[PDB]
């Protein structure tokens, strides 16, 4: 057929011309799928071989069934990503190859209970939660430091301020760092259509500060849209589990002290003011250590400031080279 070859050539030329266009946005998957094995891809053999929880950068538009995008991997080329509706269709295709999907079982009972698939056998039901396969995460993952104690106490503030200064100095002219005074742990997406749309309603949420949290959410989203690296200095993070189910999914950076004895003698080195809160500092430290390593993205366990600095610098250099 000439039409399929013509559309193949048109898509290839469009990709070649749009390889050097500004990036539009980014998304993150949560399902295991490959973009090359599908027959509906407009270009065969040049699909995306992604897995669960991967990041894609989209630049231009194709149709309601596919988009054009690249991976955040180093050297990743341009491929086609199935659309939200297309992914829903392929997911329905995933749960149709089985013998049955609805209520009528096939346990040696054929010919009596036909039971045509009701609304319970389609995607119409199961809307109690309805977790979307695709989520619009920020284009650049925010960098956040956690540990080794509560934010707002001398040891943690200095052990994070030194790293913040190193990041600012090493990446000067290519990084923006801002302190997020407002709360961030409530970065929800599916609470309601608009909780507190107006501040003059004088409601429970209208008079609250939740709208500030959401506004900071779009502020972070638009700053990540700028493609420059972002580092957060919000003093309301003490465990990645508090910001793991949200849409941001920030790069969790852990600075850990090797032993509780070292941490508490460090705390003793400050004075009586921190001796007063030493108890809660130790409690938060042990709770955060009990968090498993796979929860975090990078670890900083070296006792030398420098070694940790070049460790973080190398990781962010890899990220920068990967997304360009």
């Amino acid at each position: 057929e000439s039409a399929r070859r013509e559309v193949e050539s048109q898509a290839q030329q469009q990709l070649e011309r749009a390889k050097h266009k500004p990036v539009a946005f980014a998304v993150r998957t949560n399902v295991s799928y490959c973009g090359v094995l599908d027959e509906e891809c407009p270009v065969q053999g040049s699909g995306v071989n992604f897995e669960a929880k991967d990041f894609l950068h989209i630049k231009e538009k194709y149709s309601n069934d596919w988009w054009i995008g690249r991976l955040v991997k180093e050297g990743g080329d341009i491929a086609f990503i199935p659309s939200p509706q297309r992914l829903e269709s392929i997911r329905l295709k995933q749960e149709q190859k089985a013998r049955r999907s609805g209520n009528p079982s096939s346990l040696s009972d054929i010919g009596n209970r036909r039971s045509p698939p009701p609304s319970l056998a389609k995607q119409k039901q199961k809307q109690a939660e309805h977790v979307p396969p695709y989520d619009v995460v920020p284009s650049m993952r925010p960098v956040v430091l956690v540990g080794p104690s509560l934010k707002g106490y001398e040891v943690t503030d200095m052990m994070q301020k030194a790293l913040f200064d190193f990041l600012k100095h090493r990446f000067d002219g290519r990084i923006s760092i801002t302190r997020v005074t407002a709360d961030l742990s409530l970065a929800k997406r599916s609470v309601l259509n608009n909780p507190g749309k107006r501040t003059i309603i004088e409601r429970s949420s209208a008079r609250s500060s939740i709208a500030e949290v959401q506004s900071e959410i779009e502020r972070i989203f638009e700053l990540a849209k700028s493609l420059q690296l972002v580092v957060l200095d919000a003093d309301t993070i003490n465990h990645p589990a508090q910001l793991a189910k949200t849409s941001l999914a920030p790069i969790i950076v852990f600075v850990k002290v090797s032993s509780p004895k070292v941490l508490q003698r460090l705390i003793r080195s400050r004075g009586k003011s921190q001796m007063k809160h030493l108890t809660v500092q130790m409690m938060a430290y042990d709770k955060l250590v009990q968090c498993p390593p796979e929860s975090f993205d990078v670890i900083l366990d070296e006792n030398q400031l420098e070694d940790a600095c070049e460790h973080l610098a190398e990781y962010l250099e890899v990220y920068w080279r990967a997304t360009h």
Binding site: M159, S258, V262, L266, L305
Partner: peptide
């Protein structure tokens, strides 16, 4: 470890 975790933590916010 204490030597590296005492000077470095007391120079930033400090």
């Amino acid at each position: 470890d204490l030597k590296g975790y005492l000077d470095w933590i007391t120079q930033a916010e400090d």
